[PDB]
Design an enzyme around this catalytic site. Structure first.
Site, PDB file in Angstrom:
ATOM      1  N   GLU A 109      50.094  22.123   4.677  1.00 41.12           N
ATOM      2  CA  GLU A 109      48.891  22.927   4.481  1.00 41.12           C
ATOM      3  C   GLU A 109      47.616  22.101   4.422  1.00 41.12           C
ATOM      4  O   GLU A 109      46.547  22.649   4.681  1.00 41.12           O
ATOM      5  CB  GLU A 109      48.991  23.753   3.192  1.00 41.12           C
ATOM      6  CG  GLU A 109      50.219  24.625   3.151  1.00 41.12           C
ATOM      7  CD  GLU A 109      50.187  25.691   2.065  1.00 41.12           C
ATOM      8  OE1 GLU A 109      49.400  25.552   1.095  1.00 41.12           O
ATOM      9  OE2 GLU A 109      50.963  26.670   2.204  1.00 41.12           O
ATOM     10  N   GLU A 132      57.382  37.216 -10.904  1.00 40.58           N
ATOM     11  CA  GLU A 132      56.984  35.953 -10.288  1.00 40.58           C
ATOM     12  C   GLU A 132      56.461  34.964 -11.319  1.00 40.58           C
ATOM     13  O   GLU A 132      55.542  35.267 -12.100  1.00 40.58           O
ATOM     14  CB  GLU A 132      55.910  36.166  -9.224  1.00 40.58           C
ATOM     15  CG  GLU A 132      55.623  34.874  -8.439  1.00 40.58           C
ATOM     16  CD  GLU A 132      54.416  34.962  -7.547  1.00 40.58           C
ATOM     17  OE1 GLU A 132      53.581  35.871  -7.734  1.00 40.58           O
ATOM     18  OE2 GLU A 132      54.309  34.093  -6.648  1.00 40.58           O
ATOM     19  N   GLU A 155      54.851  30.396  11.604  1.00 44.65           N
ATOM     20  CA  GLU A 155      54.839  31.317  10.476  1.00 44.65           C
ATOM     21  C   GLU A 155      53.508  32.050  10.348  1.00 44.65           C
ATOM     22  O   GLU A 155      53.252  32.665   9.306  1.00 44.65           O
ATOM     23  CB  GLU A 155      55.152  30.571   9.176  1.00 44.65           C
ATOM     24  N   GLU A 157      50.566  30.904   9.923  1.00 48.67           N
ATOM     25  CA  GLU A 157      49.865  30.289   8.810  1.00 48.67           C
ATOM     26  C   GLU A 157      48.733  29.456   9.387  1.00 48.67           C
ATOM     27  O   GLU A 157      48.980  28.516  10.150  1.00 48.67           O
ATOM     28  CB  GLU A 157      50.828  29.433   7.987  1.00 48.67           C
ATOM     29  CG  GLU A 157      50.291  28.942   6.655  1.00 48.67           C
ATOM     30  CD  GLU A 157      51.274  27.986   5.963  1.00 48.67           C
ATOM     31  OE1 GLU A 157      51.805  27.087   6.655  1.00 48.67           O
ATOM     32  OE2 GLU A 157      51.538  28.152   4.743  1.00 48.67           O
TER      33      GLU A 157
HETATM   34  N1  LIG Z   1      53.630  39.311   1.544  1.00 47.73           N
HETATM   35  C1  LIG Z   1      54.385  38.819   2.521  1.00 47.73           C
HETATM   36  N2  LIG Z   1      55.055  39.657   3.349  1.00 47.73           N
HETATM   37  C2  LIG Z   1      55.780  39.127   4.345  1.00 47.73           C
HETATM   38  N3  LIG Z   1      55.971  37.845   4.660  1.00 47.73           N
HETATM   39  C3  LIG Z   1      55.286  37.047   3.821  1.00 47.73           C
HETATM   40  C4  LIG Z   1      54.501  37.446   2.759  1.00 47.73           C
HETATM   41  N4  LIG Z   1      53.957  36.347   2.107  1.00 47.73           N
HETATM   42  C5  LIG Z   1      54.421  35.312   2.772  1.00 47.73           C
HETATM   43  N5  LIG Z   1      55.226  35.674   3.832  1.00 47.73           N
HETATM   44  C6  LIG Z   1      55.893  34.794   4.802  1.00 47.73           C
HETATM   45  O1  LIG Z   1      56.328  33.624   4.137  1.00 47.73           O
HETATM   46  C7  LIG Z   1      55.568  32.488   4.638  1.00 47.73           C
HETATM   47  C8  LIG Z   1      55.478  31.411   3.579  1.00 47.73           C
HETATM   48  O2  LIG Z   1      54.976  31.991   2.345  1.00 47.73           O
HETATM   49  P1  LIG Z   1      55.110  31.253   0.914  1.00 47.73           P
HETATM   50  O3  LIG Z   1      56.059  30.095   0.990  1.00 47.73           O
HETATM   51  O4  LIG Z   1      55.312  32.297  -0.136  1.00 47.73           O
HETATM   52  O5  LIG Z   1      53.664  30.653   0.606  1.00 47.73           O
HETATM   53  P2  LIG Z   1      52.333  31.375   0.074  1.00 47.73           P
HETATM   54  O6  LIG Z   1      51.315  30.298  -0.129  1.00 47.73           O
HETATM   55  O7  LIG Z   1      52.070  32.538   0.983  1.00 47.73           O
HETATM   56  O8  LIG Z   1      52.700  31.957  -1.376  1.00 47.73           O
HETATM   57  C9  LIG Z   1      52.754  31.098  -2.554  1.00 47.73           C
HETATM   58  C10 LIG Z   1      52.025  31.797  -3.677  1.00 47.73           C
HETATM   59  O9  LIG Z   1      50.636  31.951  -3.300  1.00 47.73           O
HETATM   60  C11 LIG Z   1      50.324  33.333  -3.026  1.00 47.73           C
HETATM   61  O10 LIG Z   1      49.371  33.832  -3.908  1.00 47.73           O
HETATM   62  C12 LIG Z   1      51.615  34.132  -3.230  1.00 47.73           C
HETATM   63  O11 LIG Z   1      51.396  35.350  -3.926  1.00 47.73           O
HETATM   64  C13 LIG Z   1      52.537  33.205  -4.020  1.00 47.73           C
HETATM   65  O12 LIG Z   1      52.404  33.468  -5.404  1.00 47.73           O
HETATM   66  C14 LIG Z   1      54.280  33.149   5.144  1.00 47.73           C
HETATM   67  O13 LIG Z   1      53.491  32.264   5.935  1.00 47.73           O
HETATM   68  C15 LIG Z   1      54.959  34.288   5.907  1.00 47.73           C
HETATM   69  O14 LIG Z   1      55.664  33.776   7.014  1.00 47.73           O
HETATM   70 MG   LIG Z   2      50.854  28.417   0.820  1.00 45.72          MG
HETATM   71 MG   LIG Z   3      52.774  26.935   3.314  1.00 41.42          MG
END
Ligand SMILES: Nc1ncnc2c1ncn2[C@@H]1O[C@H](COP(=O)(O)OP(=O)(O)OC[C@H]2O[C@H](O)[C@H](O)[C@@H]2O)[C@@H](O)[C@H]1O
Ligand SMILES: [Mg+2]
Ligand SMILES: [Mg+2]
Ligand SMILES: Nc1ncnc2c1ncn2[C@@H]1O[C@H](COP(=O)(O)OP(=O)(O)OC[C@H]2O[C@H](O)[C@H](O)[C@@H]2O)[C@@H](O)[C@H]1O
Ligand SMILES: [Mg+2]
Ligand SMILES: [Mg+2]
Lengths: 202, 205
Positions: A109, A132, A155, A157
């Protein structure tokens, strides 16, 4: 401190209300009451989405913080923009450690290698409705190496790195420019602990 | 210094679909958005927990340098906590037509038996915006902690609440120790630790 323990509550069952990428579960339970009795059977809807690791990337030499910007569509309805300034963070999968996730996400990231680390806090995001838990670490970085566009395309992202001074980041919390729980908690912690932390790491 | 890069004009929400509706909802957002290196994303979907938004009240006694905490069971804490009974801020969901201040004052009475004097905004935050839309808006409220005691909450709503009074310093040490570890309380009590000197001067004049 608190009054009752796990000896004072029985979860009778959990029913999966929705199973997709995340889950929503109905917890059915009974628990002791402060007046001395037992409740009847209570049900609560609980959002199950696993748990996360959060990294505050702090450069103690420069007194700088690395932020990451990305869209969070859930912010749209109550925010001026759904793009948020946040901490490096990701979900913790089976058999991974908080710290290994933090380091993997700092690389993916923000392009950052992390040196020393210290725990900040581990918190429940919103425990009336979701299980969570997020575990925050502060990680030693060289903020001069933090720049550019990162995130994993496969992803969907898409992440932009921003480097600010610590005081600037905290000003952005005060102003509401940074207003997600993980970042607010981490940067308030930093404002309470930076003197000792910079001393430890310099 | 520039800040964020894109605005609501840079995202197209194609549709939302309710996947589950009960007390709360789980919605599927379908959308496209600008990319930093240029161009538009393809269609992306995210599952979002929709439970409305909340008001939070930190009850602070500036004469005594004390805070009032409320204890209640939060069963979602069970799997990651030694006990699901948490020490928390006064807090409640905001119904349509209500202000954060109106909700905070009502809940202070219902949950802690507290009359509130002046209030000041602390902060408004997104609880976890990768997966839930929930926003919580925190006020600090002036209270007399010597009036804070007993068992409260709405029994017809299965809401069973015990009042605790502790020093500000003890409450903050409990944040540091992990004995208080819910976001709203952590944020409010860190803010208090950063602002209590000026707040006590403001409210005891
Ligand atoms: N709501 C969703 N619905 C579907 N797929 C999802 C979703 N969120 C993530 N993905 C998929 O999962 C991938 C990786 O998501 P992760 O490892 O969790 O990272 P983060 O930084 O997003 O979430 C971390 C925290 O920060 C945030 O505040 C959250 O609420 C958590 O509390 C996404 O790119 C999608 O491919
Ligand atoms: Mg993240
Ligand atoms: Mg990430
Ligand atoms: N998960 C649930 N499922 C079903 N009913 C519920 C649930 N939660 C509450 N109710 C019902 O709704 C009644 C009133 O709920 P209120 O008290 O206004 O909201 P709050 O304080 O719970 O949530 C406020 C914030 O603090 C918390 O941390 C939350 O995560 C939020 O972030 C309860 O007595 C139940 O009958
Ligand atoms: Mg409440
Ligand atoms: Mg209530």
């Amino acid at each position: 401190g608190i009054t009752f323990s796990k000896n004072d509550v029985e979860i009778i069952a959990r029913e999966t209300l929705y199973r997709g990428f995340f889950s929503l579960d109905l917890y059915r339970f009974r628990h002791r009451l402060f007046n001395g009795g037992m409740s009847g059977e209570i049900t609560r809807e609980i959002f199950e989405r696993g748990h996360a690791a959060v990294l505050l990337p702090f450069d103690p030499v420069r007194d700088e913080v690395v932020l990451v910007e990305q869209i969070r569509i859930a912010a749209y309805d109550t925010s001026e923009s759904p793009w948020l300034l946040e901490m490096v963070a990701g979900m913790i999968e089976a058999g991974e450690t908080v710290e290994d996730v933090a380091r993997r996400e700092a690389l993916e990231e923000a392009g950052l290698e992390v040196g020393r680390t210290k725990p900040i806090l581990s918190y429940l995001a919103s425990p009336g409705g979701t299980s969570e838990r997020l575990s925050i670490l502060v990680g030693e970085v060289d903020a001069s190496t933090a720049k550019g566009i990162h995130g994993l395309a496969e992803e969907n992202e898409d992440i932009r790195v921003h480097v600010v001074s610590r005081e600037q980041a905290y000003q952005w919390v005060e102003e509401g420019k940074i207003d997600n729980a993980a970042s607010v908690i981490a940067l308030q912690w930093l404002q309470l602990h930076y003197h000792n932390l910079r001393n430890e790491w310099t």
